[PDB]
Amino acid sequence: NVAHGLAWSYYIGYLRLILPELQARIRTYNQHYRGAVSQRLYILLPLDCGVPDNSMADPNIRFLDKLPQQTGDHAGIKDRVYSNSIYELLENGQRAGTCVLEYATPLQTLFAMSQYSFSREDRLEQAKLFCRTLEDILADAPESQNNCRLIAYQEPADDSFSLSQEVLRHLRQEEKE
């Protein structure tokens, strides 16, 4: 599968290097800036493989601040910085949650291969495989340990579903556990 290898390498290429030190960067911010970060990387997995080159497309999901940068030497890039963004989530207009939110960038490729002049059905199937594979990796992975959540979703249409309520729901079971 293309999606099988896109999921492995997203783990070996990004997650296995940022998740180990993610929660420590979160504590650093939460000390110097109940409206706090959920100590976990919430990966938006748009099943439509629609990832933006710009999360504000769904209101109530608003950017707040950037997480302290992690610099690590990688593949010849000295102090390769790993940047991550913290977003506020709003319910009824008020801040009901703050978390580190970002799209799975590999799903973007499944899109370009299906955006037409693969099939839109193959995209759904392989996006699902990517989610199912990456979730199985992150289950057996030793670096993924109460630090990552895979938010798979599919807005049937723009005038439709509230990701804010979808991600906030995950934020509540966090606090409940």
Question: Residue 119 binds what, of ligand A8A, a copy of itself, none (CB under 5 to 8 Å, by partner type)?
Answer: none
Contacts of 45 (CB under 8 A, 6+ apart): 103, 104, 107, 127, 130, 131, 150, 151, 152, 153
Separation of alpha carbons 135 and 151, rounded Å? 10
Q: Residue holding tokens 């960038």?
A: 105
Taking the least distance from each CB to a copy of itself, the nearer of 114 and 177 is: 114
Window 55-84: contact mask with a copy of itself (x via CB under 8 A): x-------x--x--x---xxxxxxxxx-xx
Contacts of 160 (CB under 8 A, 6+ apart): none
Nearest approach in angstroms of CB 87 to ligand A8A is: 15
- CB under 6 A: which stretch of 7-15, 39-47, 111-119, 141-149 binds ligand A8A? 7-15
Strands 94-103 and 77-91: antiparallel
Separation of alpha carbons 86 and 99, rounded Å? 5
Window 93-112: contact mask with ligand A8A (x via CB under 6 A): ------------xx--x---
Separation of alpha carbons 43 and 11, rounded Å? 12
Give first-to-last CA distance, the chain, whole Å.
Answer: 36
Binding-site residues for 2',3'-cUAMP sit at 14, 80, 105
Where along the sequence are the contacts to ligand A8A (CB under 6 A)?
6, 9-10, 13-14, 74-75, 105-106, 109
Where along the sequence are the contacts to a copy of itself (CB under 8 A)?
1-6, 8-9, 12-13, 17, 44, 51-55, 63, 66, 69, 73-81, 83-85, 87, 101-106, 108-109, 112-113
Binding-site residues for 2',3'-cGAMP sit at 9, 14, 80, 105
Binding-site residues sit at 9, 14, 80-83, 105
